[PDB]
């Protein structure tokens, strides 16, 4: 029951490292490039952005769970704190994350907005 409208505002916390750009190159939310493009993230295979240099931990999660694609629930869990999520999914205490940013509240709203921007999910 996240609110995508509120989620768009919440996205201001993410924009410094992530943009939302359509495959055609259309900017939905102009943002940085430290992190991968979030357009179509819902339903997308974990760490699958082309040309994006992902960290070791998330690549390990993809490798270990090949069929894993991001679901809204997983996304909410991950943005809460990537660290523990990665430890959980890799069973590796030392799992490294390139994303240290944590979102302790309003996770569902931001996820709802990501979903709005994952039209073909
Ligand atoms: C704002 C609340 C957000 C949200 C919703 C997301 N991020 Fe980030 N992010 C950053 C980096 C360097 C990465 C790559 C991580 C790595 O390799 O370990 C990510 C990755 C993500 C994902 C995974 C994307 C995938 O393709 O699988 C998701 C869903 C995600 N982020 C959401 C870096 C940053 C930041 C840099 C300082 C900031 C701020 C954010 N992220 C913010 C958010």
Q: Residue 53 CA: which ligand 1 atom is closest?
A: 17
- DSSP letter string, the chain: ---HHHHHHHGGGTTTT--EE-TTS-EEE---SSS---TT-TTSBTT--TT----HHHHHHHHH-TT-B--HHHHHHHHH-HHHHHHHHHT-TT---S------S-HHHHHHHHHHT-TT-
Indicate if ligand 1 lies below 6 Å from the C-beta of 103.
yes
Strand partners, 20: 29
Instruction: Give 83-86 contacts, CB < 8 A, sequence gap 24+.
Output: 86/57, 86/58, 86/60, 86/61
CA dist 51 → 37, 47, 104 (Å): 11, 10, 29
Q: Look-up: residue for tokens 């495959």?
A: 23
Indicate if ligand 1 lies below 6 Å from the C-beta of 12.
no
Q: List the domains of the chain with CATH numbers.
A: 1-121 (1.10.760.10)
Indicate if ligand 1 lies below 6 Å from the C-beta of 75.
yes
User: Is 17 annotated as ligand-binding?
Assistant: yes
Indicate if ligand 1 lies below 6 Å from the C-beta of 34.
yes
Q: How far apart are CA 89 and CA 21, in angstroms?
A: 28
């Amino acid at each position: 029951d996240g609110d995508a409208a509120k989620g768009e505002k919440e996205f201001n916390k993410c924009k410094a490292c992530h943009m939302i750009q359509a495959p055609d190159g259309t900017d939905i939310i102009k943002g940085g490039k430290t992190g991968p493009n979030l357009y179509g993230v819902v339903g997308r295979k974990i760490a699958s952005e082309e040309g994006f240099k992902y960290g070791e931990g998330i690549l390990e999660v993809a490798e270990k769970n090949p069929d894993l694609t991001w679901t809204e629930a997983d996304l909410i869990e991950y943005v809460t704190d990537p660290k523990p999520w990665l430890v959980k999914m890799t069973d590796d205490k030392g799992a490294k994350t390139k994303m240290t940013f944590k979102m302790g509240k309003n996770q569902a709203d931001v996820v709802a907005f990501l979903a709005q921007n994952s039209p073909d999910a």
